[PDB]
């Protein structure tokens, strides 16, 4: 499928919910129809004004039209998702979901992302992710929740559109979901003091983390095959139990520090310069990820300063356990 095919579909589509959608709304314990219609209208105000600020004051009506295409995609996918959910569970139990402002904002943001990214490929100014999050005052972690389901729900997405949304998901998983403003930390706290969404998120993070670790270990540690499982064990425990280390930081920073730490206690010579040089070969790796790492307050410095001052501060005794007579029980490898 092609850009033109999807865009034809959207240009032909209705601005209002279908009768099927309205049926779903009317079957809810709390009727969400008016909230949903008003939310679409209100966000229209905000979107078109922020679009004109970004692109030029003469572009308000272009922004309006692009918003309308986004809304049409949002209604299509919403109906598809609801149909799927009803089929899978054999019941409609949609009131809590459909009255959730955050579900609607995430779904609309994802629809708008597909539209913004498609226009931003062609032309001036790049309105691709994460621009839409700031426009909508939406957190990355919330946007994340709809991506896989959105992809499944819109069979007319191009391979390029799907790849883009997958790239967005990865950026959320690796850093955006771990910013200090992320609902993720309240969800962790709720569980640590329980959440199916927390479990699903962590499962996805583990798979991404492990795959990236594996690539680095296959390049750097070919001679020492036993190391990968041990590094994975430090890495996984750190993500699970020392999650505050991820706050305002990046998955790959924890990855490289875990690699360095284990090799260090295993008496294996692997300086950061070597890890870092191999790291910048990873598919989407940027140098800033090891050159600019949060230390304490507003203070940023290299990954080495982070390792020496924060990472080891917190984990020195945990790392030493791996070389002791009783090493910690090794973490299972995430499958797939």
């Amino acid at each position: 499928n092609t850009i033109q095919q999807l865009m034809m579909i959207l240009n032909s589509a209705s601005d209002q919910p279908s009768e099927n959608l309205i049926s779903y709304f009317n079957n809810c314990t709390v009727n969400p129809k008016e909230s949903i219609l008003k939310r679409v209208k209100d966000i229209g105000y905000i979107f078109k004004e922020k679009f004109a600020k970004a692109v030029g004051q003469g572009c308000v009506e272009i922004g309006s039209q692009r918003y309308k295409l986004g809304v049409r995609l949002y209604y299509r996918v919403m109906e598809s998702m609801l149909k799927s959910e009803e089929e899978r569970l054999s019941i409609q139990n949609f009131s809590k979901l459909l009255n959730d402002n955050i579900f609607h904002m995430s779904l609309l943001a994802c629809a708008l992302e597909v539209v913004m990214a498609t226009y931003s490929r062609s032309t001036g100014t790049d309105l691709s992710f994460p621009w839409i999050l700031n426009v909508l005052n939406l957190k990355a972690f919330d946007f994340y929740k709809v991506i896989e389901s959105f992809i499944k729900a819109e069979g007319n997405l191009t391979r390029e559109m799907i790849k883009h949304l997958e790239r967005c998901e990865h950026r959320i998983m690796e850093s955006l979901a771990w910013l200090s403003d992320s609902p993720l930390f309240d969800l962790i706290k709720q569980s640590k003091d329980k959440s199916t969404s927390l479990s699903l998120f962590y499962k996805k993070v583990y798979r991404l983390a492990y795959l990236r670790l594996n690539t680095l270990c296959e390049r750097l540690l070919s001679e020492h095959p036993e190391l990968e499982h041990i590094i994975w064990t430090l890495f996984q425990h750190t993500l699970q139990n020392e999650y505050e280390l991820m706050r305002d930081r990046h998955l790959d920073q924890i990855m490289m520090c875990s690699m360095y730490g284990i090799c260090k206690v295993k008496n294996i010579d692997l300086k950061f310069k070597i890890i870092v040089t191999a790291y910048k070969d990873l598919p989407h790796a940027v140098q800033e990820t090891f050159k600019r790492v949060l230390i304490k307050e507003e203070e940023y410095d290299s990954i080495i300063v982070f390792y020496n001052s924060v990472f080891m501060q917190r984990l020195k005794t945990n790392i030493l356990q791996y070389a002791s007579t009783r090493p910690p029980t090794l973490s299972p490898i995430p499958h797939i």
């Binding site: 959910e85 139990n93 979901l97 709809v146 896989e148 959440s195 969404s197 699903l200």
Partner: peptide, 10 residues
């Protein structure tokens, strides 16, 4: 994908 019920702790 997971159900929407799972994704929203419903």
């Amino acid at each position: 994908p997971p159900t929407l019920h799972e994704l929203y702790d419903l």
